Amino acid sequence: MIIVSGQLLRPQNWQIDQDLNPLLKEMIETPVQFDYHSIAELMFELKLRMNIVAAAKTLHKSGAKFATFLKTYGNTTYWRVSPEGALELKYRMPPSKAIRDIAENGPFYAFECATAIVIIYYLALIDTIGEDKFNASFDRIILYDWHYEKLPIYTETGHHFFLGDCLYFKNPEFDPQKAQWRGENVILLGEDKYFAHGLGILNGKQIIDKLNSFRKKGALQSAYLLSQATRLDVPSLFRIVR
Amino acid sequence: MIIVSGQLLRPQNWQIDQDLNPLLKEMIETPVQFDYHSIAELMFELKLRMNIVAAAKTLHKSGAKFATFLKTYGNTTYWRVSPEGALELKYRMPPSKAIRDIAENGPFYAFECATAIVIIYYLALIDTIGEDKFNASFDRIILYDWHYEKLPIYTETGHHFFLGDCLYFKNPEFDPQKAQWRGENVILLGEDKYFAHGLGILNGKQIIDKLNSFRKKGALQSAYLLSQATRLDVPSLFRIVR
User: Fold this and answer.
1) Counting C-beta atoms within 10 Å of the first and last residue's C-beta, which end of chain B has fewer, N or C?
2) Do B84 and A89 touch (CB under 8 A)?
3) How many CB atoms lie within 10 A of CB B81?
4) Contact A154 B156 (CB under 8 A)
5) Distance (Å) from the C-alpha of residue A158 to the closest C-alpha of chain B?
6) A82 CB-near residues (< 8 Å, 6+ apart)
7) Which candidate from A84, A89, A236 shows the least CB-CB separation from B154?
8) Nearest CA to CA, how far is B13 from chain A (Å)?
9) Dihedral sign, Cα of residue A91, residue A93, residue A96, residue A102
10) Mind spelling out the 3-state secondary structure of B24-87?
11) How many domains is chain A built from?
């Protein structure tokens, strides 16, 4: 359900990018309410969300690897690794150049799946608003777990998902000697289609089966898709940038 | 105006912490709308906001000082300082305790005013959800500008403000040679009463006048209070406790 100003948007024709149509159909048909001040905001969400999808695929293809925090590394042209495994943007380096380098020199990087999600958000935002506006607003950067600079992010409960969502597979009876498998953050790329950093681009069964193989002795509870979604607050983000 | 589960909340008696009644009454009477899925959820917001106010006051009295990023320091028992000026939680230090140390050993810390706001949010959250839930969720921490570990924070346009809001005094024609005076992030502690890291607890006039004394030659634009509020998203946070 899409509401622009206070008018409900029904099947009302438009000359927009085709690859946006599937998402827009989801957002119109869903019971979930999307409120916008304007069409430009809605258009920003559509493009940002499909750019999140594209960026996840870009990261997947990049050659960047999975590593635990203590094994994390990056291109020292742009990033310093803290002892705890944070990737710190070096003094006065351009944020967009440094973040895009992850895509362009993937082999020089390895990091965690949460870190990968934030990276994907930044890559998508850069693709959406351009290097100049991104650098102006998100001018200091450290990539580390779920740290982000200024981004307005929220997580909500429910079973209705949309392309570009960040979702989570929980593995409740994971093997305690392998806490790395307690669950998996993913980007929703398509119907039953996920980006999962370190695992690849897989469907749900694949992810759940993989998780289920690293459970404790005698474990009976299967891994499963949590009913929640982590999302960028587009009106708030629109405000910062545009 | 408070609406809970689709029902308006008008004056209705309750057995709650007196400390919360002013804010509650303020949030009922105002024309702006607050929506909750439960009473528990509203109670969380009242407590969280009053804890933000208390935390600002705590930081004020702690002895923690203002410093630029390049001059930022912290208690090295808990925090390492990156070259760029980030305060990085040391490997396997308890997050709640490291953050609380800012209040308990204030003179060992100096940091910038965005960093200060984030610290106040963490201090308030610990007070609101307790150390166990805090440490379970916010298990990795770097204090640096507007970096957040999982915090759901957004900024909206408006001119109706409430206790615990984060506001901004802008200095459009600040002296380019004194960039720290670009503006001042504040927490609203009461009517025309602000916590301003590095300035103290001041009214609006005092902050504007202070800012105005660090403007370029011949400046005809006064520093002024922006029509915006920075806020924690309660439903995202409330997920944690229920």
Assistant:
1) C
2) yes
3) 19
4) no
5) 12
6) A88, A144, B80, B82, B88
7) A236
8) 32
9) negative
10) HHHHHHCCCCEEECCHHHHHHHHHHHHHHHHHHHHHHHHCCEECCHHHCECCCCCEEECCCCCE
11) 1
Method: X-ray
**Cβ atoms of B236 and A155 closer than 8 Å:** yes
Q: Which of A146, A157, A236 sits opposite B155 (nearest CB)?
A: A236
**Resolution of the PDB structure in angstroms:** 1.9
CA-to-CA dists, residue A43 to A16, A50, A134, A213, B161, angstroms: 9, 11, 18, 42, 30
The answer to whether the CB of A188 falls within 8 A of the CB of A203 is no
Across chain A, the runs of DSSP E, i.e. the strands, are 2-4, 7-9, 34-36, 65-66, 79-81, 87-89, 110-111, 142-143, 147-149, 153-157, 166-170, 183-190, 193-196, 200-202, 224-225, 228-232
Closest chain B CA to residue A139: B145
Q: Given the structure tokens 């504040």, which residue do they identify?
A: B186
Asked whether A196 and A186 are in contact (CB, 8 A), the reply is: yes
Stated length of chain A: 242
Q: What is the CA radius of gyration of chain B?
A: 19
Tokens found for residue A195: 């980006």
* Contact flag A152-B148 (C-beta cutoff 8 Å): no
Cβ A147–B146 below 8 Å, yes or no? no
Q: Which candidate, B79, B4, B67, places its Cα nearest to that of B35?
A: B4
Q: Which residues is B200 bridged to in the sheet?
A: B196
Tokens of B218: 């011949």
Q: List chain A gaps (C–N > 2.5 A) by preceding residue.
A: 12
Which domain range does residue A49 map to? 1-242
Chain B positions in Cβ-Cβ contact with residue A148 (cut-off 8 Å): 147-148
Distance from CA of B221 to the nearest CA of A (A): 22
**How many distinct helices (H) and strands (E) make up chain B?**
7, 16
Q: How far apart are CA A80 and CA B91, in angstroms?
A: 17
Given an 8 Å threshold on Cβ–Cβ distance, is A88 in contact with B86? yes
Q: Residues in chain B whose beta carbon is closer than 8 A to a beta carbon of chain A?
A: 69, 80, 82-84, 86, 88-91, 140, 142, 144-150, 152-157, 233, 235-236, 239
